[PDB]
Symmetry: D2
Subunit: 417 residues, 4 copies
């Protein structure tokens, strides 16, 4: 009925879940309304998320709303075993997630999740939805809709749409303003460095840190690396973010040129093989590589393993690969999302807004069942904006409002001298 | 045939125009192609722009393209008289612009510009287009299309559209990525502080600087104020930018609360009466107010003039208003765009991209004459992106490109474990 | 002969210790020379330090020099049990330090250390040196010199001197340029935020963080707090650093004013009761307080415990005090050094320079026995400067040198 | 008796001078007391300063104190002609300074100044003091004391001392905390970028800016360059500041390596020929070079003029040197202090503290006549500290003070 490491961890999990809730007031307000209105009565739901204290708070909100949920891990290394135990023991929510599970177990958990015959699927990376569409065409009648948490998953869903197989509504949670403006940027910025520091306790100041990608995540990682005293190099494939990085004070160059200069490399591109053997070959002795994109394939670790003569664990979450010429490359978190693998992921303050979008996106799918076209849907503007209003209020920040006279001016095109 | 301060200033103007061109290579490339292809042969054009060295380089590019142009000032205080002289004397381009001209002269220049019967109108603030639509309905057959440089003008054009009177194509230059991502942000950031410093030589470090608005301009002004050692307060009307400002490290509060704390106030909202008598009344003795939004109406200077018992000029571009209770309020640039009134406006590096958009937007209007719907048009993505590619190249910055294998991964929705 | 938690944790300690050595290249060379020259032959030593991977690497250097060393914890919560086990087990260095040891056990270890009859005492807070002066006047015959690692220890030594009881050479390690320009500033800046984040995983961006003190540590904490997106308030008692903080972009104000605004309070003053009952009473519901200065007494936790009707642990290293009106005050690390209590302390890069100073200051005391005047002695400038040169080289950074004509120009007027 | 450009510019000078006074509150109070006590009664004085609105406010303070003052320019390009006219016309203070005066005229003014037989000399670069020692040995009978405003002047005085010719009291104004912690750092940081921008209106964001020297000025310039979006490289000759720059996030390297990367070079070293012919030869086409340290000799412009086949003025304060291969080198301010040559120098806020030091250092020299030992004397700590207190108060910032028990805790060990 579940598959977890150790249910005796539930008390620790409960404590950390309650602490996380302190900065998730928006989701708390949503949970209390769900508790009354039960939008998910009779709905079966699968969530493929990072099994964290923040995901637990989302699961509790969906549970209050009546959802018959089943949670599986989005990544083998991000699972928090105490959280899994608490969800099973305290809430009776089936969880199939073991920190460190092998790929066979991960894939079996996806099969178990699809056997739940979900009506709603919350995905983080689109693994489950892709598996649904590829292997479970006979189940598609169950689907009211799905949601997608992260940028990599949105890219996959776009490919599904262009391939003609996205035959149901999918909510683009990642691209909501109150999601990727804060989660992807400020959350990833802090928690990526957190993971690197918990793994290595390395001094960031004075180090050359290479950030691959200058999108929402790259901007955050570079900003916080800079804030911690690092010399920051940015790599890119598109000129607009490249000019931005330069005018933000960072050096921009091709990865081949960055490869011999970086002390720490951090990939946040969403793309495959951004760091390759031709790069490993020129890296400093002891260069550190890690990834905060969704999938570890941003770094060609398979080639690194094949080239290296020895690999050994030298600290928690930290492996030293020794190359035939004696130089070493350090890898954190086995190349998996370093903030979640070596630390705890984003602080709950930003996950409050991301998972408020998840909850209200699920509600949107059910309230509009039978009225949404197949394909990708953006979060409604009014929902996006109300999440922002509520979060600003809960942060204790007050701002101004337009007067009628100011509205009159906006609408009066004739005036201006 | 023109109306300028002093044509003997042309040699100084020529020198400053040539210097500005050094960081406008993208526009230079466009000018050389226009010189060959003459896209504006037989076209009459009016430009209502800030009469700066950067605008002169745009005017020279349009002139090379065959445009029969006429230039008027977008603001009485932004005109550079040496630039006006050089355009008339060296290029024979009619200019109607005198730094410090009164409102009657400004309005007469708009009338002269409309009497040119332009086919294309480049506007900065939409004064000329609004006057065209309100007073010159009988001329609309001349119009191939117009362009708009700034955010205030886009807002006016939206009101014209909603009012049913935008009956021709208008290119939204401001909202091109290569325009407001750099011009509005990094350009305004540097040149606003430049104007304040040229006006007052005040030490920015240790001062509390209140930035009204956290859009593209507000982000830039806050970023550079912070970079110069100021304590930064941000005011807003919308929660998304408000949360952003907080997570960027700034204090966010209503203007009423900021009013008693700020040493320098900078308005960049695009809206009317953001600083009002109720704010003046609680400001520190010697508080400085200035505006970098397009129109000075962001500050209620009319009420300040009526309240004050004395006003006197205390330094270039700097007025001291003494209130009946003896406290003083300092105003820079008479509330007109402070970067252009008290300094030289944006550096040419960013105007290279803004005015490349202007030139290519004008070309777009002519090449597509008879095929564009009335209403607002965005800059085509391929044009926007090519400007970015060329600017990055001219900045000497190299970046990466996706491999076929990386493209295959983007398109393969099934893979990911 | 040792008092540790679990000797079976030694492999993990050695793992983390060698990892830490990777960015201790300067101390490596000093230890390499020590094993060749054995400065500390027949010299017994006590170290009262934080029991960390970096302190271990220092102890390994003194051992390499022939030192007969004994290590005790400087703070019951900073001790790393795997490091204590590795030292006892892989090097034969007696360690008396157990993470979370009570007050009795702490001073029982200080009594064991002085029963070692140390010739050299390395101190971090002036705790053992102050006990030696107080209770072991008969043992002063054995002291060649002592060293002090922290600002608070330097302040107490100055009072010992002014009191007329600093009757031996004391090396001011903290005030060496290569120590507190970097350790106190860059080290404390990063590792203090590290401790807060490991304790709470709180988002720092958008929070108001109040930093009490703008000395070396305060500058570092404020700089990194700001770098992580916080609105930073600085409190002070001296005008020069107060003006600096304002010109660095921070809001300077009295603590009574900061108390109603701060989301997180960090004390780095070296002084007693900087956060007081009258501040708790006006703090925001859920305000976090922690200390990175000395001991814990920077926060008046005794008064907080009296104002509060309930206290509970709510996360690792994190206590929630609930006041009668229902508002809470969060305390991290029981008011002890938050970087060492909730995390691992400074990265080894900065401790490389701090502990190279320690190792050479110990070398100085020994090589100048019976030649040192009583009182405090600063690190020699050449030593301080050589550490910087070695570190800069180890970091792979090259700089310029004056040409003969540039020298000739400095001399003419 | 005066040598200025145009006495009719005086109203504009007085306008700008009083504006500058608004953020010179500390100097205001000192001048207020001076007019009451007249410390400089019967005392003749020379000032060799930059002829700015802030220097004017200093001269007005010495005049208020009874000073018989004469002012000459410290740099032919820093002189503000309207300020010179206002001083002559509104206060009767002889000024010998003309913006853009040639070399002959400069030293003709230095000869006029010493013919004033000054009892006090305020110097900015040690120019007049070095001429007094060289040529006016007979006038040393008149010297009560002198003062020096800049690091370069301090270095030359040290050589005068070591040479055995500093036979009078010299006040080290530059090294007072309230002077170079702020003026040299925050003042130079802003006003150097101000000069570059007024000269060129170049976008600083996205440029690589090379800062030669990481002392007080270099830290300030690098900090603000970075704040304005530049990629900052720092060069150095000393390891301690080099490590600081790296830990502050800047790229540290030899100038030979920086020369091929920099878009803008800023020298703040105090030393000769820091940018040399072998650097010009590898610079990017259009690289900008300027100096904010001393004199101009930090950049080897003599060699540049020889490498170049042509030079032309291309904007105010801006020259383009074109080399035989067609590449250009841009020089701002003819290599003179770019903040003062192309802009207005430091804002008066920082000069408030620098010139309060000057005014009180002059008070010190006079009130201790015949009591000062020959050589350099630092600003008394109480004076330095009182300036900070007054400034902090004037800025509207309040801070804390220790309670009696907190004091009692500092003293116990
Ligand atoms: N670890 C976390 O907690 C977390 C949180 C949010 C998102 N993410 C992941 O981070 C990744 C990036 O997300 P985002 O929102 O920043 O995406 P984004 O689309 O906003 O930006 C990605 C950027 O990377 C650039 N890029 C692409 N390929 C590149 C290459 N080969 N080299 C250099 N730059 C390249 C793109 O041009 C773009 O600017 C995704 O995989 C996303 O799922 C992780
Ligand atoms: N001076 C320059 O050289 C220059 C350059 C570009 C744009 N501009 C002008 O700057 C202004 C702002 O442009 P932008 O591109 O940043 O626009 P924007 O739409 O990106 O942002 C404006 C911001 O102001 C906020 N705002 C609106 N009314 C407000 C109020 N009453 N109080 C506080 N915040 C308020 C909005 O919520 C928004 O976030 C416009 O007038 C534009 O034309 C000036
Ligand atoms: N946690 C760590 O790892 C670590 C490392 C090094 C030092 N420290 C400790 O941190 C403390 C500070 O060290 P430092 O080097 O910054 O000292 P410092 O002497 O350089 O600076 C202390 C500053 O605090 C100010 N101050 C004193 N009392 C104050 C009060 N009541 N309110 C506000 N400001 C006050 C002083 O004016 C001074 O500017 C010391 O106890 C030192 O031992 C901790
Ligand atoms: N422009 C202004 O308004 C202004 C104001 C104050 C001081 N200054 C001048 O600026 C200069 C620097 O003053 P400061 O207070 O920063 O001095 P400082 O002594 O504090 O720092 C100078 C730094 O330059 C470094 N240095 C010396 N020679 C070098 C070289 N060849 N290459 C690289 N680095 C080198 C030194 O190691 C030192 O760290 C002096 O000439 C001073 O008079 C100018
Ligand atoms: N603390 C966390 N809890 C749950 N999901 C997280 C956490 N941190 C990051 N994520 C999510 O994981 C996604 C990447 O797989 C990001 O889009 C982000 O929303
Ligand atoms: N240097 C300049 N030359 C011409 N136009 C400018 C300059 N600086 C700012 N502007 C423009 O003025 C507009 C505001 O009226 C901005 O959108 C910007 O594009
Ligand atoms: N990782 C660490 N190992 C040992 N001592 C440390 C560590 N981090 C900080 N310290 C020291 O602890 C002292 C504070 O008590 C500081 O002087 C500092 O040098
Ligand atoms: N505005 C100014 N007025 C007078 N002196 C100045 C000004 N700006 C900088 N200086 C001084 O010039 C010296 C550099 O020669 C510095 O010591 C600094 O104090
Ligand atoms: Cl709700
Ligand atoms: Cl082209
Ligand atoms: Cl050695
Ligand atoms: Cl006084
Ligand atoms: Rb995990
Ligand atoms: Rb292998
Ligand atoms: Rb309007
Ligand atoms: Rb102008
Ligand atoms: Rb009036
Ligand atoms: Rb894929
Ligand atoms: Rb610990
Ligand atoms: Rb000299
Ligand atoms: Rb000047
Ligand atoms: Rb004490």
């Amino acid at each position: 009925k579940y598959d977890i490491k150790d249910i005796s961890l539930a008390p620790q999990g409960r404590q950390r879940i309650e602490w996380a809730a302190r900065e998730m007031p928006v989701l708390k307000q949503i949970r209390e309304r769900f508790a009354q209105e039960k939008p998910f009565a009779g709905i079966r739901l699968v969530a493929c998320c990072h099994v964290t204290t923040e995901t637990a708070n989302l699961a509790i909100a969906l549970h209050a709303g009546g959802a018959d949920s089943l949670l599986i891990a989005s990544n083998p290394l991000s699972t928090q075993d105490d959280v899994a135990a608490c969800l099973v023991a305290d809430y009776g929510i089936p969880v199939y997630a073991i920190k460190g599970e092998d790929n066979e177990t991960y894939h079996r958990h996806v099969q178990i999740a699809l056997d739940h015959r979900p009506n709603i699927i919350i995905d983080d990376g689109s693994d489950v939805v892709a598996t649904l569409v590829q292997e479970r065409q006979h189940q598609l009648s169950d689907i009211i809709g799905t949601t997608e948490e992260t940028t990599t998953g949105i890219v996959r869903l776009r490919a599904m749409f262009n391939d003609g197989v996205l035959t149901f509504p999918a909510m683009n949670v990642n691209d909501a303003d109150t999601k990727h403006f804060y989660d992807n940027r400020y959350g990833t910025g802090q928690s990526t460095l957190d993971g690197i520091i918990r793994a290595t306790n390395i001094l960031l100041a004075g180090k050359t840190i290479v950030v691959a990608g200058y999108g929402w995540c790259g901007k955050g990682v570079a900003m916080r690396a800079k804030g911690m005293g690092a010399d920051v190099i940015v790599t890119e494939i598109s000129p607009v973010p490249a000019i931005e990085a330069a005018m933000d004070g960072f050096r921009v160059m091709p990865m081949a040129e960055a490869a011999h200069q970086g002390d720490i490399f951090i990939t946040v591109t969403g793309n495959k093989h951004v760091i390759r053997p031709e790069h490993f070959a020129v890296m400093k002795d002891g260069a550190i590589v890690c990834n905060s994109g969704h999938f570890d394939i941003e770094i060609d670790l398979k080639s690194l393993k094949e080239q290296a003569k020895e690999v050994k664990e030298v600290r928690n979450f930290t492996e030293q690969y020794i190359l035939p010429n004696g130089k070493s490359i350090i890898v954190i978190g086995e190349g998996r999302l370093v903030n979640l693998a070596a630390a705890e992921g984003h602080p709950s303050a930003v996950m409050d807004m991301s998972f408020a979008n998840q909850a209200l996106a699920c509600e949107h799918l059910v309230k509009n069942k039978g009225q949404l076209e197949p394909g990708m849907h953006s979060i409604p503007v009014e929902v996006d904006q109300e999440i922002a209003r509520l979060k600003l209020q809960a942060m204790g920040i007050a701002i101004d409002s337009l007067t009628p006279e100011q509205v009159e001016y906006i609408n009066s095109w004739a005036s201006g001298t």
